[PDB]
Subunit: 236 residues, 4 copies
């Protein structure tokens, strides 16, 4: 059985009462941090997929937080959602629940915006994640007012620590352990062309990298199917 | 977009504070009452299937209540879960939410125990349901024995009783009044498969029109996640 | 009995899936929109007070939404939380639940940030609210500085603007149209006490009829739990 | 800050998916198991009192489970709610959350039916609880169909292991550590006379026992006030 937790807690980093959904195996569980997309909250994975069922025999906890429309970024005009997602949230989840801390037992995945977030986490903090997966990700954040609120000076984005293309090259230069990477996209997604460009870039860097594509749009039926393939791929 | 409601309310019939999950289309919606199985609560359909996504374009509300381990029965030793499910619960849902009341806009479906409950509702109150569907249903109800006695009372009196779907089907076969659209499915490896085949053969021999489907499967949520999509397409919506 | 609803719904104005808590009397209910403070969400009123009990005999619904750290403002750098709170949210609540629309049956109240929001609603839309109440409100809005800029834009342009409750009060004092019942309270040890005294003196000098109350207290929920009972008794219900 | 958890989990003892509400201090917390009354569920304490606020500075976790209309009893015709509340539930809560196991850090309290339940737990398992409190308790369960479903043969109740009057005498004969006991009741409660009888009985047994009464009915305003006094009395 999986136990389901709707958690209403305080974030000191955000200065905000907020929520997350956690599923735990019932008797230091390896943990998948599962990130939502643009306009989503912490409830969408549970509602629009059968994620709880898919993990049921894996001995795997899943943590599903909320980051509003932040692109997992410490916003130029907004709250500190990167510091939240990369530092405070995992700490809070580990303080509440019997979750692993070891890199080998820690994974991250997300769709769209959360695919960007997952790869950013894996590549900025390779020492914290064994695997990072993007589903139909917004993988090129280079460039309107909302984007400026998130990133600030848009012209400063290429080559920055926000730029997954540059982050991938930096991670590939590490000599320490780095996460395995997974990327998928539906071939009719508006983000498909960005995905192809990222794939062609990241696959030449000597990384442990898996790409998949098939018919699909920016749509939950596609992610319900694909998340099962991500789960099978996790180095659990 | 569908709006999701976790509802904590009081049941006068049960004398108990309890809960249900409701999903509503966002702008008198036709409503599917979607019943849980044995050991489940009002959260299982949302958790183990993508039901909210499956209904998203249908203009269909879904009401998922809890009845504990009652088999949708006014228990001989327990609470009045049949009066709750058949009378109070739909009234409460309609009082809270912009839900239809008309027979033509009212449907019920369930797995296991809830498949029994759905067909019981459809055959006891055919005037209230346009359609009733059972998925891997516990369709023959004739520590575990003690629990059955708590639910049904004298077990020897069950055959032919108003609890017995086989008897209810005989009533329906002779009815001149409204008969709901009726659906039955089961996985061929389910422990309840034999009971399902016996119920199917019974209703078919009576002339009672059912859509019957079977395919490989056990008593598990992968099968119901797939099958509920077929039930949704089949609803006379 | 009151029924409790945790509602997860989509806001088109915000472009965001979000949540609210609603309590409904169990059988077009008059409705109190009850606003949270700075750093709070839609759950705090239920958790830190006995609001559900306090309204239980009033035939009054309560809607408790979330606006993050927005000060109920269409942010210069952020989302449109004023259009959300003043337009979309009441519409959504009324679409989901059997809530009144009439001015005479519509009230708003809030603490801190939400007291500012309540009085902003009452004074910008006096035709929509029979009453507006502020509890320990942040009634003068003229890292923290950067956040204020994200909310309000050019801070130097705030005095006299449509964000400025002092200016809105001047409009109301000259209005021939409907004016809501208005309430203001604050604990005498609250950091916001001085701002509250300045707002009180301003509106009193204008002739704008407020019930004003003060007593020992800080910016904390014990005080609001006590004071919300007085606000409830004061509502023109 | 307190973090709030709505927990939907499976009970093997009950054979049932069920729920509880838990509040945790935010950074082995001592834990108060806080029991609901007749017709209540696991949500009523949070809704009708300010319990979360009252415990906010205490370093105290609160666990609020659901037992339906069972009187915290392994029912003669029903489910095993005593085995659930006394064995499975605390184990599950301790498996999910960072809660203490030590007797010295474990307390129980409840209103009505849950006051009966709390004292039954304290007196049947003195080795597990440092303190047990009843608020407007249904403290005399001696004797309709529902009562028979709960207790079975009603004539067998006097002197039984269901009978708090007898349990109190048995606990007072223990030589090992036993919980401090608290009892209160509103003077206009229908249960007042039963409470006076229990008080007069239990206060002559050499126990650590505190009684309080004041005007009140079987009503949440009274319990909102009284639970604060219980919290101050806990040997925390």
């Amino acid at each position: 059985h999986m136990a389901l937790f709707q958690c209403d807690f305080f974030s000191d980093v955000l200065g905000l009462s907020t929520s997350m959904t956690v599923i735990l195996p019932q008797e230091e569980h390896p943990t998948l941090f599962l990130l939502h997309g643009l306009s989503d909250d912490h409830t969408i994975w549970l509602r629009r997929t059968s994620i709880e069922r898919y993990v049921a025999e894996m001995g795997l906890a899943v943590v599903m937080p909320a980051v509003h429309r932040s692109f997992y970024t410490d916003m130029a005009h907004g709250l500190q959602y990167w510091t939240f997602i990369s530092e405070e949230l995992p700490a809070l989840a580990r303080s509440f629940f019997p979750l692993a801390t070891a890199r080998e037992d820690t994974f991250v995945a997300g769709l769209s915006m959360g695919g960007y977030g997952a790869l950013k986490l894996g590549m900025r903090h390779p020492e914290r994640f064994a695997a990072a997966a993007s589903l139909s990700g917004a993988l090129d954040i280079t460039f309107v007012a909302e984007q400026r609120n998130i990133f600030g000076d848009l012209a400063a984005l290429p080559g920055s620590d926000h730029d997954l293309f540059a982050l991938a090259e930096r991670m590939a230069q590490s000599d320490g352990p780095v996460p395995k990477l997974y990327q998928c996209c539906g071939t009719e997604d508006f983000l498909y062309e960005d995905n192809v460009r990222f794939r062609d870039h990241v696959r030449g860097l000597g990384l442990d990298f898996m790409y998949e594509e098939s018919p699909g749009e920016h749509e939950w039926g596609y992610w319900d199917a694909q998340i099962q393939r991500v789960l099978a791929w996790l180095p659990l």
